[PDB]
Subunit: 253 residues, 4 copies
């Protein structure tokens, strides 16, 4: 199942979409600068691109780390990003009451992994009718993603993206089960699956991120998700592999 | 470090405290019945007791599943429990806004394991000044507990309990690392460590719960956390606690080293 | 099911048996000194005791680190231990050819974890008719122990001990699943289950917490190593604590 | 570091080599037939190929299960394979005493995963001077492989291949850490690393799964792939495409 996000088609058989940006929104000027860089690189390579940032990050490393500019100013910034570059945007939400006003502006709303089972947030997100990115918790098996999908469906929204971020592997370390992508596709109706390489790696380097991104994209994925000419060299390699993989028909039976 | 909860002393070298009750509050009458049984049994065995229940099941499999009585009715039930039995109570909170009204009634407020990283909820809980039970996520190592403790300390609340519930082990399975208890004691300032045997078995029986509870308490813990239904069958509670008390008494009588 | 090892009764509802000794037999006099200390401490506390050592360490840190004294001299040392102290002994075997000559002298023979699926060794060990200790591989689940047991049974030997050594937990880390003891008892006919606390680790407070936790589940024995690994002089204090817990547990009927 | 195996160049920046064949040798005729198929498919795709089989099944579900043909008869069969097809072969050894006679015939000798820390078998294998394939145990981390490599080096053999077969993941399951390949390259002197996809899937062996997993591993730039209506060819076509692309990009 493909999802149209403005003029982008997101799907496990479509050219990969890059989701990237900055961790937390700080100011209009700084956001536009970082976004302009992603936009310039992705436009040069012909890669569809969706700008990501948090306006109110609830799982910060310290209680006083900056949460972001907050909802009202954050949405103003996202409007400006959309107006300037004509690209879609994605942001996370953590309170039910935020979902509607965020969804007025942000094309894709994201369900944090730690909130993935919180029924009230699932419902409030579903009811926006917007495209939703579901971050897969590290302790959930790929066959359990269907239960989250089922709750969104009950609440009336099927425009769901499944975002891999690795799996708990003993203490601290995460490992990405390359077989999990296929399991999610088979059990969740072939919804777009994207790969958050960055999270998957923070518990373990450019060479690593490249190996791990390439390995995942070799399984045929709708997109690559990054958390905060290097970007260019990286994306050239990902695009090479993605173009190859996507040009070949799915093996048939 | 010990924590006083009314007349209870909770600590890793004190007689174990039972945190027991039910999954979710369903009615006043059922709650009082179950509680009365836990109270009668614990009083005769001389085990300090704190009644546990959730007022809301926030993460059920279906949007349409029964969720429990809710905050306003739930707090009314907890008030009645406290008035009738004179014991402390514990419940979980899932939204920052709930922390203050819950804390007015409930002696211990609990941070759900799935929410342990939710910084706004930590801060809201800390600011109540109540005793807090931190459920250790299945995906977090015992040496990472200190980062959660640090957050509560930076927010001004040091009355913290660390609650083991097992660790992720492959897909859809949990294992309890009996060494993790000592790691949490050594890295988190010897705050009280308790063991949720019920949720540690989620992915696996009476015999199993006893073996696991005995093993954990053998490491010298402040408390045991469990659920029953009329989860262990409620009528087996007394026999189960006799065994746990026997072991706890023995362990706590031996000097540390 | 209990197993008689000379005058010792080994079983999940019997007083625990200590299996202890050293890593590798390196010399006679030092072996006897160490054994003497285990004997004195276990005799004082009334704990049945089986002396453990390897004569041929097949998995060494370096290719030329000393393997140990080898079969012929190792068995002579075991005979001397048996003659001097009148206790049983346990050692591991790595090759089918070693099973007979080791079984003639040693009261328990041990199947190394890394060799647990090697059918020729299983058969050769089974055919000795000796008591066998099966070391559970860190990658095998407790419900897969029955398959090793089955192979010993097919080969005609039911005098089997199952020995927990922990489970692989991510990289380089082991966890002991306290529920695995019960799974092994329920699936393998209540054969004696013993706990190798030493190999389950990789320090004193940790070994004690882990040993107590395990023994709380009701086990036939505890398996450990010391160095002249727990320090040998703290042995008494350690065993006092284990015995206290074992005595309490075993004095209570199984919850039925 | 590359390894020459007759006319094959095995290395992490060389075209991938397929190591493939069968579980256990059962008879001369069925071996030749299977080998002929691998040869025909690999030759037409232009993929270097090494034939794999065991002469003995050392871990049998039953004491009375069939064990395979054994050393003497097995080595006869391997000699016939080499003579008929002019390819190298690989087999595993389980006892020190077997290493020299096996090594006279078999181009690559393999250290079984369960025996990787058996020092006497390491030494005996090293002393053959043959190319050795070291199967990484499911319970050993990638950073520990350097200790095995060190032993073989001390014993005088540097012609080592490191073979990934997955890592223990809870009970009765495996997962393959795609970052482990890089760890092994970086810590073991860039020795050839190959991927045993077959054994990595033991606990899951669907065709779509094997392909996804093989493609993912080969995306990390490996020396080879190890495995046991025209499934092999369809699979190899896709693997070769990806390998050619990855190998054509310069290392960063
Ligand atoms: Cl997570
Ligand atoms: Cl709970
Ligand atoms: Cl959890
Ligand atoms: Cl092992
Ligand atoms: Na004997």
């Amino acid at each position: 199942m493909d999802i149209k996000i403005n003029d982008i088609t997101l799907g496990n058989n479509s050219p990969f979409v890059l989701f990237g940006g900055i961790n937390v929104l700080e100011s209009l000027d700084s956001t536009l600068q970082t976004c302009a860089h992603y936009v310039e690189v992705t436009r040069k390579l012909g890669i569809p691109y969706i700008f990501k940032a948090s306006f109110d990050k609830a799982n910060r490393s310290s209680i006083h780390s900056y949460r972001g500019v907050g909802l009202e100013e954050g949405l103003k910034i996202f409007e400006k990003v959309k107006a300037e570059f004509g690209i879609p945007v994605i942001t996370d939400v953590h309170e039910p009451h935020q979902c509607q006003p965020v969804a007025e502006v942000c094309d894709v709303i994201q369900l944090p992994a730690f909130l993935a089972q919180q029924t009230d947030l699932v419902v409030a997100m579903a009811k926006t009718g917007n495209v939703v990115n579901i971050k897969k918790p590290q302790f959930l098996s790929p066959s359990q993603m269907k239960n989250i999908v089922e709750k969104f469906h009950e609440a009336g929204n099927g425009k769901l993206i499944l975002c891999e971020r690795g799996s708990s592997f003993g203490y601290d370390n995460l490992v990405v089960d390359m077989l999990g992508f296929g399991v999610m596709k088979q059990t969740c109706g072939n919804l777009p699956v994207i790969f958050d390489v960055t999270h998957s790696l923070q518990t373990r380097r450019r060479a690593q991120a490249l190996d791990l991104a390439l390995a995942g994209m070799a399984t045929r994925l709708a997109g690559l998700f990054l958390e905060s000419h290097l970007l260019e060299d990286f994306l050239i390699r990902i695009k090479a592999l993605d173009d190859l993989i996507k040009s070949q028909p799915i093996l048939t039976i």
